[PDB]
Amino acid sequence: MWPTRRLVTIKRSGVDGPHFPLSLSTCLFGRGIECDIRIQLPVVSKQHCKIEIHEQEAILHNFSSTNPTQVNGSVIDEPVRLKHGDVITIIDRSFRYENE
Template identity: 40%
Template structure:
């Protein structure tokens, strides 16, 4: 597991995923597990054939966000590094799944 050396975010911060697809969509993370994938049963759907139905999840507790790949077929990278287990996200991280690039933002 990659652990960032940055401090956890202060309570009350909002975390969001922003796909770089020109759609202007944003997905605000809820406290708990947020599953991202191609399936209709996910919290945040990415209509990309290179994305698994349940590709990864982000566990957000209001302070820290941890991305976990859910055994996806094509893998997940954060800032160009393939994630095998989990990764603690920091503001501005770039998540690539299939051909889709998603930014992690905290504000």
């Protein structure tokens, strides 16, 4: 009853940071408080990226053009499908998508 799809935000290069439980089927990234994944960095956009949770999959929805979100060290031109254990990286922060 606990699929527990957690989004772990790596604090810095080398260690695990605070976790982010998913209460909403839609995850949004950015400075704006409206973002499920609040980020405190002027460079990051209000609606920088978005993870849309599906029956069994998490889907990224990048809006930023100049500074696009990144996955596994790969630039994201448009929304893409994510695999369990995939790593998402923005301008200076990283997020982990784990589906237990």
